[PDB]
């Protein structure tokens with residue numbers, strides 16, 4: 042597919058996954074994505090800075106050919122958990138020949154007092170017990186920033202059949218969301234215990250669990 | 256299919272659907288709004304053609320171009336649509352012509368395709384643990400609806416209760432959508448026993464409207 046352009050290409054910069062910054066064990070990554078990379082000029086150069094200090098541990102993924110006859114070059118910067126949580130600024134400077142001037146883009150965590158999420162499990166409506174599957178609701182509210190991970194389990198095994206809304210801005214400038222775990226109605230009435238797990242900066246050990254059962 | 260060639264020196268087109276509530280209530284007026292921005296001073300003249308299922312229509316209302324502070328014009332055309340045409344999945348095409356374009360820009364919009372699915376509406380009282388706080392969360396779960404166009408509201412004694420927030424529709428595993436709406440009320444107003452109603456407006460409901468009540 043022919044679709045050339047000229048500045049040159051666009052840069053997009055993405056933060057780490059909430060979960061990855063909140064557990065020491067995980068590897069949080071800031072990601073600099075370059076699109077609209079031409080063929081006459083498909084080599085890409087990356088500079089990375091942490092609070093204006095250059096760092097060199099960036100890894101560049103191999104080019105991936107796009108439907109519209111452009112290239113997509115991605116550079117991945119592993120970050121220190123506490124750096125990201127302490128609000129350090131990450132700069133991705135992109136040099137390509139189609140750019141007279143380097144493109145600089147900067148991201149950091151949302152600013153301001155972290156706020157503890159309140160976690161409340163809600164059993165199915167009596168009206169839903171007619172169906173063969175029921176809705177186990179986890180309300181998470183009062184949290185800031187919006188960065189959060191929600192998970193579900195029973196007998197310390199991950200429940201797979203859940204969906205979680207994105208965070209929504211509340212009137213107080215806090216965030217809330219809802220996570221819906223869908224189970225066979227029998228499992229509910231049989232009285233199996235279900236856990237809603239929430240990971241967030243403003244929790245002790247960055248973790249809480251509210252249990253739910255008949 | 257490959258996309259039509261775009262250019263920066265030329266204008267841009269944005270085409271906006273009716274509001275969900277506007278198509279579901281015969282008393283309201285649903286509209287499709289075609290907005291052209293970045294119209295150059297040197298080519299200010301804008302031509303709109305409108306098509307319903309590729310059949311040109313003539314009843315659209317076009318407003319005088321109005322200058323922005325960045326020294327480009329923004330031009331708007333409004334097509335009133337018949338409620339039953341939108342809900343019967345008709346395709347609304349805006350065609351925009353300008354000397355700064357190699358060819359006219361075409362944009363299309365319609366209700367998302369597929370068999371409508373009735374929303375199930377379930378009210379959930381505040382958690383035991385939330386009763387220690389001064390304000391409590393009245394929860395309205397709406398699941399199994401298609402398409403994602405829906406309106407949700409709250410009320411008590413037939414008076415709108417406005418201290419609520421509603422999640423976007425979320426794609427569910429069965430290809431249907433769900434959302435939650437959170438109404439926030441003083442714990443007092445819940446404990447005295449006042450009655451709160453969660454209202455859902457959707458295509459696949461009888462008369463496009465249901466209500467599920469909630470109280471102590």
Ligand SMILES: *[C@@H]1O[C@H](CO[C@@H]2O[C@@H](C)[C@@H](O)[C@@H](O)[C@@H]2O)[C@@H](O[C@@H]2O[C@H](CO)[C@@H](O[C@@H]3O[C@H](CO[C@H]4O[C@H](CO)[C@@H](O)[C@H](O)[C@@H]4O[C@@H]4O[C@H](CO)[C@@H](O[C@@H]5O[C@H](CO)[C@H](O)[C@H](O)[C@H]5O)[C@H](O)[C@H]4NC(C)=O)[C@@H](O)[C@H](O[C@H]4O[C@H](CO)[C@@H](O)[C@H](O)[C@@H]4O[C@@H]4O[C@H](CO)[C@@H](O)[C@H](O)[C@H]4NC(C)=O)[C@@H]3O)[C@H](O)[C@H]2NC(C)=O)[C@H](O)[C@H]1NC(C)=O
Pocket residue numbers: 044046051053055056057058069070071072074076077107108109111113
């Ligand atoms: C040529 O084609 C390519 C691609 O074509 C594609 O394939 C074909 C078949 C089609 O299907 C086509 O539609 C496809 O896209 C075109 O490339 C695109 O270029 C545009 C820019 O023009 C990019 O648009 C931006 O998208 C941003 C979000 O992108 C993510 O989400 C989408 C899904 O919706 C994905 O497609 C992307 O890949 C991104 O996905 C994310 O990628 C991250 C990096 O890996 C992931 O995070 C990482 O995840 C990994 C593992 O997954 C690790 O955990 C890492 O730790 C972690 O970092 C992330 O999970 C993943 N997320 C998701 C959601 O999946 C938008 O942010 C951005 O919006 C801004 O900019 C727009 C203007 O350009 C503007 O209109 C918007 O309003 C918004 O503007 C901003 O608004 C904010 C306020 O919110 C302001 O603060 C900002 O200042 C403001 N910015 C600006 C600039 O004004 C863009 O919309 C598009 O993503 C990109 N696609 C890809 C794949 O790269 C190319 O354009 C074509 N060329 C031409 C000329 O046509």
Ligand SMILES: *[C@@H]1O[C@H](CO[C@@H]2O[C@@H](C)[C@@H](O)[C@@H](O)[C@@H]2O)[C@@H](O[C@@H]2O[C@H](CO)[C@@H](O[C@@H]3O[C@H](CO[C@H]4O[C@H](CO)[C@@H](O)[C@H](O)[C@@H]4O[C@@H]4O[C@H](CO)[C@@H](O[C@@H]5O[C@H](CO)[C@H](O)[C@H](O)[C@H]5O)[C@H](O)[C@H]4NC(C)=O)[C@@H](O)[C@H](O[C@H]4O[C@H](CO)[C@@H](O)[C@H](O)[C@@H]4O[C@@H]4O[C@H](CO)[C@@H](O)[C@H](O)[C@H]4NC(C)=O)[C@@H]3O)[C@H](O)[C@H]2NC(C)=O)[C@H](O)[C@H]1NC(C)=O
Pocket residue numbers: 267269271272273274277285286287288290292293323324325327329
């Ligand atoms: C010069 O200025 C002009 C004008 O700006 C103004 O003046 C300047 C000086 C400033 O003061 C500025 O603050 C002023 O606003 C600039 O014009 C802008 O151009 C940009 C594009 O460059 C437009 O950006 C798009 O915005 C869309 C959202 O638009 C609405 O929402 C914003 C607020 O978020 C409003 O400000 C807009 O006015 C729009 O508002 C809507 O208006 C509708 C029409 O009236 C309303 O609907 C109707 O409402 C009535 C009642 O009111 C009835 O209900 C009718 O029934 C109903 O139809 C509606 O209420 C209202 N909405 C809201 C929420 O208020 C974005 O949608 C759009 O995004 C798409 O495209 C991007 C790429 O361009 C992409 O990144 C996005 O992801 C998204 O991509 C699309 O995704 C969709 C699905 O999501 C797909 O269909 C497509 O595949 C895909 N498209 C593409 C192209 O790939 C853009 O971000 C901006 O709207 C516009 N402003 C205005 C006011 O017109 C101009 O840029 C300046 N020029 C220069 C060079 O600087």
